[PDB]
Design an enzyme around this catalytic site. Structure first.
Site, PDB file in Angstrom:
ATOM      1  N   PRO A 112       0.590  -1.119   0.051  1.00 57.17           N
ATOM      2  CA  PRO A 112       0.167   0.052  -0.023  1.00 57.17           C
ATOM      3  C   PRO A 112       1.006   1.091  -0.248  1.00 57.17           C
ATOM      4  CG  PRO A 112       0.243  -0.658   2.483  1.00 57.17           C
ATOM      5  CD  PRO A 112       0.641  -1.698   1.479  1.00 57.17           C
ATOM      6  N   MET A 113       0.268   2.266  -0.643  1.00 58.33           N
ATOM      7  CA  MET A 113       1.518   3.073  -0.798  1.00 58.33           C
ATOM      8  C   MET A 113       0.346   4.889  -0.770  1.00 58.33           C
ATOM      9  SD  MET A 113       4.546   2.094  -2.940  1.00 58.33           S
ATOM     10  CE  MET A 113       3.703   1.123  -3.982  1.00 58.33           C
ATOM     11  N   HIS A 140       7.112   5.516   4.407  1.00 61.79           N
ATOM     12  CA  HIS A 140       8.040   6.087   5.670  1.00 61.79           C
ATOM     13  C   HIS A 140       8.009   4.651   7.009  1.00 61.79           C
ATOM     14  CE1 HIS A 140       5.311   9.664   6.044  1.00 61.79           C
ATOM     15  NE2 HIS A 140       5.265  10.126   6.584  1.00 61.79           N
ATOM     16  N   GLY A 180      12.058  -4.142   1.957  1.00 57.28           N
ATOM     17  CA  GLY A 180      12.589  -2.994   2.142  1.00 57.28           C
ATOM     18  C   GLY A 180      13.284  -3.740   1.066  1.00 57.28           C
ATOM     19  N   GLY A 181      13.944  -2.113   0.151  1.00 60.44           N
ATOM     20  CA  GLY A 181      14.646  -2.227  -0.640  1.00 60.44           C
ATOM     21  C   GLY A 181      14.538  -3.957  -2.324  1.00 60.44           C
ATOM     22  N   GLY A 199       7.042  -1.724  -2.858  1.00 61.68           N
ATOM     23  CA  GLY A 199       7.055  -1.280  -3.485  1.00 61.68           C
ATOM     24  C   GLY A 199       7.284   0.247  -4.397  1.00 61.68           C
ATOM     25  N   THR A 200       8.693   0.253  -4.070  1.00 62.41           N
ATOM     26  CA  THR A 200       9.485   1.400  -5.085  1.00 62.41           C
ATOM     27  C   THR A 200       9.512   0.443  -7.098  1.00 62.41           C
ATOM     28  OG1 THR A 200      10.901   2.176  -3.761  1.00 62.41           O
ATOM     29  CG2 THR A 200      11.119   1.730  -5.396  1.00 62.41           C
TER      30      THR A 200
HETATM   31  C1  LIG Z   1       5.954   5.730  -1.995  1.00 61.00           C
HETATM   32  C2  LIG Z   1       5.762   4.935  -0.459  1.00 61.00           C
HETATM   33  C3  LIG Z   1       4.666   5.820  -0.022  1.00 61.00           C
HETATM   34  C4  LIG Z   1       4.036   4.145   1.176  1.00 61.00           C
HETATM   35  N1  LIG Z   1       3.062   4.278   1.848  1.00 61.00           N
HETATM   36  C5  LIG Z   1       3.488   3.323   2.463  1.00 61.00           C
HETATM   37  C6  LIG Z   1       1.166   3.470   3.507  1.00 61.00           C
HETATM   38  O1  LIG Z   1       0.781   4.255   3.168  1.00 61.00           O
HETATM   39  N2  LIG Z   1       1.431   2.288   4.584  1.00 61.00           N
HETATM   40  C7  LIG Z   1       2.333   1.765   4.838  1.00 61.00           C
HETATM   41  O2  LIG Z   1       2.001   0.494   5.310  1.00 61.00           O
HETATM   42  N3  LIG Z   1       3.465   1.361   3.713  1.00 61.00           N
HETATM   43  C8  LIG Z   1       3.401   2.433   2.721  1.00 61.00           C
HETATM   44  N4  LIG Z   1       4.852   2.537   2.314  1.00 61.00           N
HETATM   45  C9  LIG Z   1       6.181   1.162   2.962  1.00 61.00           C
HETATM   46  C10 LIG Z   1       5.894  -0.288   2.132  1.00 61.00           C
HETATM   47  O3  LIG Z   1       4.593  -0.681   2.955  1.00 61.00           O
HETATM   48  C11 LIG Z   1       6.900  -0.845   2.148  1.00 61.00           C
HETATM   49  O4  LIG Z   1       7.840  -1.638   3.479  1.00 61.00           O
HETATM   50  C12 LIG Z   1       8.536  -0.474   1.221  1.00 61.00           C
HETATM   51  O5  LIG Z   1       7.531  -0.052  -0.447  1.00 61.00           O
HETATM   52  C13 LIG Z   1       8.809  -1.602   1.073  1.00 61.00           C
HETATM   53  O6  LIG Z   1      10.334  -0.879   0.563  1.00 61.00           O
HETATM   54  P1  LIG Z   1      10.847  -0.899  -1.181  1.00 61.00           P
HETATM   55  O7  LIG Z   1       9.898   0.024  -1.675  1.00 61.00           O
HETATM   56  O8  LIG Z   1      11.743  -0.389  -1.350  1.00 61.00           O
HETATM   57  O9  LIG Z   1       9.500  -1.845  -2.412  1.00 61.00           O
HETATM   58  C14 LIG Z   1       4.820   3.428   1.351  1.00 61.00           C
HETATM   59  C15 LIG Z   1       6.338   3.298   0.594  1.00 61.00           C
HETATM   60  C16 LIG Z   1       6.443   4.082  -0.594  1.00 61.00           C
HETATM   61  C17 LIG Z   1       7.238   3.624  -1.147  1.00 61.00           C
END
Ligand SMILES: Cc1cc2nc3c(=O)[nH]c(=O)nc-3n(C[C@H](O)[C@H](O)[C@H](O)COP(=O)(O)O)c2cc1C
Ligand SMILES: OCCOCCOCCOCCOCCOCCOCCOCCOCCOCCOCCOCCOCCO
Length: 374
Positions: free
Chosen positions: A22-23, A197, A239-240, A261-262
């Protein structure tokens, strides 16, 4: 421990051990529905919606229409941070003065008289009879996840009595143990590398060990094995994680699944600015972790404005989350409008964003690239 993959696939009725993170502000219903259609689990960021139960239901129903059935193979995600503290009128007022000056240096007119609260916390839902809890119990999504901490255990238990699996982000072994003691169904082990976050339970904790996703997974799994804990939650890593190699390395720890996410942010189903996308295509800058955007530590691609904001803001001067996000969002909007734009914006992404562009904007192609060996 034994691999949790098959149990996860059977429990959630999915083909691949992949959760699209979720983002808030970046993922969409379309992205989530597409990832569920492809055989993983889509997620919907509902962190702002704890007291807007109509929006929860409408969004889920629109997701069901995109998927084509009401199976609700989905993760509904909420924020359970501590609410901003009373008694902080001094800090808050000084932050407004700070932003007055930022607007002045940008040449943007400044109107703002107070830091408004963008949304409440799910931690403020103390009563299992609250309409949001009754609604989620009726809707029966596969998963409800929490970020920033846990709501009261009576609320957790009530959701679980409706078959919903409850997940929480954890960032260290003590947070994992908290989740275990509260009988969570799943934990999302979030590495320091993660975009957006950081889900630590203590906001901006000075003693955070900053564990990398690999290290966090190894620590948790070693505790489970060493202490002979017999019924651990599902272990999800986040994460990553950017490619099939990264995925396999973590899955070799016998965890359940990965949450990414990314890697989705280049999809044409995501909502990032053209400047944010350009950064993926031609990465020049590192990322950094800062609490000065929203009040809570988050990872963004570094820019001149975000480095300025970060270094100019001693932790003791930053209003509690999410109060600074109101000043930040209002700036970014006011900038965009009065025709300055993205120099003032945030660029949420994890520390492997520079390896995440795969020369496609297709969710399906990105998904195929990730799951090749599964
Ligand atoms: C643009 C963005 C928005 C995010 N918003 C949330 C959110 O609304 N709720 C949440 O539980 N995690 C959120 N996260 C964190 C993701 O759940 C997750 O921990 C993270 O994307 C994993 O690392 P990665 O971006 O390197 O894959 C967000 C991450 C990104 C990059
Ligand atoms: O079981 C998979 C096929 O479902 C077809 C119809 O099933 C309807 C009844 O199911 C109710 C309960 O199902 C629970 C399990 O659901 C698993 C996920 O199924 C989601 C629906 O899949 C439809 C087929 O999608 C094909 C791939 O599309 C990929 C691109 O999607 C375009 C995205 O927009």
């Amino acid at each position: 421990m034994r691999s949790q993959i098959q149990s996860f696939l059977k429990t959630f009725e999915v083909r691949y051990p992949i959760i699209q993170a979720p983002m808030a502000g970046a993922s969409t219903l379309e992205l989530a529905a597409t990832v569920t259609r492809l055989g993983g689990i889509g997620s919907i960021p509902m962190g702002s919606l704890s007291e807007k139960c109509d929006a929860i239901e409408t969004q889920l129903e629109n997701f069901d229409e995109l998927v084509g059935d009401s199976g609700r193979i989905v993760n509904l995600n909420f924020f359970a941070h501590k609410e901003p503290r009373s008694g902080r009128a001094d800090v808050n007022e000084e932050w407004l003065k700070k932003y007055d000056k930022i607007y002045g240096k940008a040449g943007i007119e400044f109107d703002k008289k107070e830091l408004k609260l963008l949304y409440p916390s799910f931690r403020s839902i103390v009563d299992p009879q609250h309409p949001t809890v009754r609604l989620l119990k009726n809707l029966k999504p596969k998963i409800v996840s929490f970020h920033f901490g846990l709501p009261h255990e009576a609320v957790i238990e009530s959701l679980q009595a409706s078959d919903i699996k409850i997940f929480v982000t954890v960032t260290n072994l003590q947070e994992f143990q908290q989740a275990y003691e509260s009988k969570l169904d799943g934990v999302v082990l979030q590495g320091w590398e993660a975009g957006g976050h950081r889900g630590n339970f203590k906001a901006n904790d000075v003693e955070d060990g900053q564990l990398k996703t690999l290290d966090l997974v190894s620590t948790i799994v070693d505790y489970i094995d060493s202490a002979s804990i017999s019924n651990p939650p599902f272990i999800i890593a986040a994460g990553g994680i950017h490619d099939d190699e990264s995925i396999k390395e973590l899955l070799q720890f016998n965890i359940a699944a990965v949450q990414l996410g990314t890697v989705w942010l280049p999809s044409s189903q995501a909502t990032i600015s053209p400047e944010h996308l350009k950064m993926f295509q031609s990465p020049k800058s590192d990322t950094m972790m800062t609490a000065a955007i929203s009040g809570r530590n988050l990872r963004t691609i570094s820019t001149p404005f975000l480095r300025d904001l970060h270094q100019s803001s001693p932790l003791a001067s930053i209003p509690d989350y999410p109060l600074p996000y109101d000043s930040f969002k209002s700036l970014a909007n006011d900038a965009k409008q009065s025709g300055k734009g993205p120099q003032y914006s945030a660029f949420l992404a994890g520390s492997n964003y520079h390896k995440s562009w795969k020369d496609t904007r297709s969710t399906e192609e990105i998904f195929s690239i990730l799951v090749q060996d599964l």
